[PDB]
Design an enzyme around this catalytic site. Structure first.
Site, PDB file in Angstrom:
ATOM      1  N   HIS A  91       0.957  -1.295  -0.131  1.00 56.60           N
ATOM      2  CA  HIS A  91       0.176   0.022  -0.140  1.00 56.60           C
ATOM      3  C   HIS A  91       0.877   1.346  -0.047  1.00 56.60           C
ATOM      4  CE1 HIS A  91       1.046   0.017   4.232  1.00 56.60           C
ATOM      5  NE2 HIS A  91       0.507   1.175   4.386  1.00 56.60           N
TER       6      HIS A  91
ATOM      7  N   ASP B 243      -1.879  -7.379   0.438  1.00 60.46           N
ATOM      8  CA  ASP B 243      -1.032  -6.094   0.588  1.00 60.46           C
ATOM      9  C   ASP B 243       0.093  -6.355   0.958  1.00 60.46           C
ATOM     10  OD1 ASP B 243      -2.115  -3.049   2.123  1.00 60.46           O
ATOM     11  OD2 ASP B 243      -0.150  -3.618   1.109  1.00 60.46           O
TER      12      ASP B 243
ATOM     13  N   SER C  28       4.759   1.597   8.925  1.00 60.02           N
ATOM     14  CA  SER C  28       4.356   0.276   8.468  1.00 60.02           C
ATOM     15  C   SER C  28       5.328  -0.783   7.759  1.00 60.02           C
ATOM     16  CB  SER C  28       3.213   0.356   7.312  1.00 60.02           C
ATOM     17  OG  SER C  28       3.945   0.819   6.291  1.00 60.02           O
TER      18      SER C  28
END
EC number: 3.4.21.90
Lengths: 52, 151, 151
Positions: free
Chosen positions: B29, B51, B103
């Site tokens: 992402h 993802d 992330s």
């Protein structure tokens, strides 16, 4: 000519979406470390192993 | 703790890529072209339902890869921004410990083995539940608590 | 200890043969002559699939053959050149411990039992990956990390 084009397009769609099914069924194994793909599944999907 | 290998991918940092097992991976992402100029030329396999883009590490660098284990006891683990509680099969952290941009950071067990990669969090009061990429025996999987936005 | 027989080529030592269980084993890629005449003469069998080169020990006068074990628990083992770390499905060695022409030396467990035989390695970076021949309960297998060149 129309029938030949239609049939060839159908064959191309079949092989392309077979490749799509191959990618969908194979990507999770290529994401998991260790990649212990069973030999039968490698024969069916016609793949190479990452660990030799 | 003892391992800092989350390679950045952009001057404007938005997440990090990691080496674990025999594979490099990063969440799918977050945009950018992975730095270090050796992983940049690597071809990535992408999964949108997971993802994540992953690739095989070059040999000369795969000694730098972290250890891997799929087994997750209930209790506490460690990561860069502190401690993670694995309760009910779900990871949680104190609210505010995670922000957009962290992330892709691996979660380690007490031995230092990777068990998960964070993707985002969901705010419930003083805690936040982690939407995270983890594994079970030979298969990647994703846990997305309701309302989690992507980090 | 000292269950290793030298394989000498015409002008140098090229490899090493070992007595494991009831059989003398040598790397099939090593060209040379066994140091002992009774073993150099002994009719000798070749398998290139596992790059292994076998014969049956004349157990009447070779009772010093080493004992073996197919179990491979995680952790440290002995290589006549230091400690090998068996991690995952791989063996890792300090990069300066091994050299070409040293193939055929077995790996010992903490009990003095042979677990695997080094057939070669791969320049791995901070370490070297060890391409070996091991066995399960009934069959042999060869572990070849990527990039492994011949020793």
């Amino acid at each position: 000519s129309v029938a030949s084009f239609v049939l060839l397009s159908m064959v191309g769609v079949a092989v392309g979406m077979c490749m799509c099914a191959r990618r969908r069924c194979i990507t999770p194994y290529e994401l998991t470390p260790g990649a212990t793909v069973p030999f039968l599944l490698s024969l069916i999907c016609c793949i190479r192993t990452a660990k030799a | 703790n003892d391992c800092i290998f989350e390679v950045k991918h952009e001057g404007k940092v938005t997440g990090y890529a990691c080496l674990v097992g025999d594979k490099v991976m990063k969440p799918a992402h977050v945009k950018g072209t992975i730095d270090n100029a050796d992983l940049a030329k690597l071809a990535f396999k992408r999964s949108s339902k997971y993802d994540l883009e992953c690739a095989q590490i070059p040999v000369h660098m795969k000694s730098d890869a972290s250890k891997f284990t799929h087994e997750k006891p209930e209790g506490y683990y460690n990561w860069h921004h502190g401690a993670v509680q694995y309760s009910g099969g779900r990871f949680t952290i104190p609210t505010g410990a995670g922000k957009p941009g962290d992330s892709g950071r691996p979660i380690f067990d007490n031995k230092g083995r990777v068990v998960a990669i964070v993707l985002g969090g969901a705010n419930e009061g003083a805690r936040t539940a982690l939407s995270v990429v983890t594994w079970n025996k030979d298969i990647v999987t994703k846990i997305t608590p309701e309302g989690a936005e992507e980090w």
